Design a protein around this ligand. Sequence first.
Ligand SMILES: [Br-]
Ligand SMILES: [K+]
Length: 731
Amino acid sequence: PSENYTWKNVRIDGGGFVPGIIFNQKEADLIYARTDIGGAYRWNSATSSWIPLLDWVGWDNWGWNGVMSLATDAADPNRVYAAVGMYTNTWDPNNGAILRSTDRGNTWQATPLPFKVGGNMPGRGMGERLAIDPNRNSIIYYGAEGGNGLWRSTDYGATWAKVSSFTNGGNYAQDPNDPNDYLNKIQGVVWVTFDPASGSAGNTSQVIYVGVADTQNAIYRSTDGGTTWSRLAGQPTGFLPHKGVYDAVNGVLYIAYSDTGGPYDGAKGDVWKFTASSGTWTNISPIPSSSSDLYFGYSGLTIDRKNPNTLMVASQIAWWPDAVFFRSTNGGASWTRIWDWTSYPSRSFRYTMDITEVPWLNFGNSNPVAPEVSPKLGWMNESVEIDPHNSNRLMYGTGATIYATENLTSWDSGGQILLKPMVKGLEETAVLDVVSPPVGAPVYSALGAIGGFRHDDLTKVPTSMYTTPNFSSTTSIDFAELQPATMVRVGNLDSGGGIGVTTNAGGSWWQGQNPPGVTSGGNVALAADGGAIVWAPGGSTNVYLSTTFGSTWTAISALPAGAVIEADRVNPNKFYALANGTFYVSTNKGASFSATVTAGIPAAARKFKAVYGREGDIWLAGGSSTTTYGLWRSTNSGASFTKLASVQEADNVTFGKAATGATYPAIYIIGKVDNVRGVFRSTNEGASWVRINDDQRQYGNFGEAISGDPRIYGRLYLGTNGRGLLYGDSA
Ligand SMILES: [Br-]
Ligand SMILES: [K+]
């Protein structure tokens, strides 16, 4: 029963991988970005921010936040298309689709494809797989994964079918024997590139190039408008084509190759130029694979459409010392580089970088060891793109951000370019945990990949993620309810796990010691008075107690490894745990636990929380469609639970400031109520619910982490997996 809400991202700016940036070839300032887990965006030049286009993807079709390819129509810039779906293994139960729009992504219609799309799979930086004929814009191609080959629509994307005459679907998988079933999928037909001079407006383009992840048959061509196809004669072998860029001014195809599909690796490759009139091949690599010291392949290939003798390419991948970008102003006959060695470990630079708007991009390290700098130029830089309307502007994606320059041709006159982040509005993090204390800052985030932050102001990017320790991913965070400046957090670092503690609300932290066997953060609880920590680390065989604020540990005998731990928010002697349908309680401040409930709680449930101000009041959410599912509450410190009749399904629960005149905190759930999936609030102890999101604001596989706000009625901090941390307020 909806209430009008306003939803916004807590401001972080970026934080994830941007495998593709796409400029429209006819309309200036029209730019899109595709992400691997976080949907797609359109740039708004009036507000200098990105606009998310796929927030209407919901609980059952969540994989469609994986955006494997996107095409914006040069001939009709209101038209845009996306290939969506997240995994090609069992982690995404649904097939992929092609989405079509006639209003720049404000709305879409879907056409399901009879196979999966791998928006968050290996190979996702190769592209674009989707391409629109620039002369007859009713014709769209899609290079598919899996060996499904080349697919096509002749009706503006509404219907799709296999191109029967294209008979090489690709034969490369990163690791065909991967027991984890992630690196083992056929990456397929990886890009489609038209020659626009091969037709005229209204008539089918006759010349089409296609890249295939097949070391021995990387490049195909049609000269009859896609009726027949054949491998390009004389092409090089041994490598996979990440990008194929065609210039009709000089009549040349440029291809960037690497020895893997990316995006995290690549040890060798080449850049080649095919001249279409003569059929000649020329190796234009800045550093060719015949050179003994090459230690990367190539991607990030882009041509300057305003001045098409100029092109750039980039390392796929140089982790050390940093990425390298190359620029040629003579069609690849010679290059210069964005940095050079002077005397190792020192370098000279053709760029400067200003992260004032996104200061956490130095990863908390303002004392890098040469030859590294901080922030770095980038990594996972598969998409590097010159603005086809402005030779001075370039944008590129990394595994954390988008950087941009507006003075690129400064390079050509011997100067430095300026690079800055360009991610306002693009919010791509996965939220693992979140807390809102009753004093101090409104919220603390625990994030994948970039650690997380104290957010002093929801409208301002935080200065730094947590340091000392700096986790790559913070998996769990807690504060002592009766002493909220005392906090703990656990997470991942340096291939294992660790714990951080603070007594000044994160003004400074320090790192505790580890119990045996820690391989990842797992989850943590802090007693209500700060006097005890219970940590269930990843990898460890047990759950551990500290009475020394993380300095030392002792094993808890009764708990299963990896149990979910929660403190009572009132009584410092009480802790709780949940694992696989058994609920456990401690009344001796975490030293020992006993099983209290072994029936009626779904085995799959793994979220529960004690209520601030209410000793022994606990709400529990979880289950599955094939077992039982819903929301349970205990008012007796976990001795028994009762299922709420008013909820069909629930996946998480939290509490926030009570409604005026109400006798209990407001309750927020991720769930299904009266046959509607969404986000729900109850201000009467669960007796009824009101939906606080809406069908355009669903955010896919959200809700791993949520928190209400004890100081602000109506507010929910809503974590997502790829759309950052949202806050909703009653309007
Ligand atoms: Br490297
Ligand atoms: K490498």
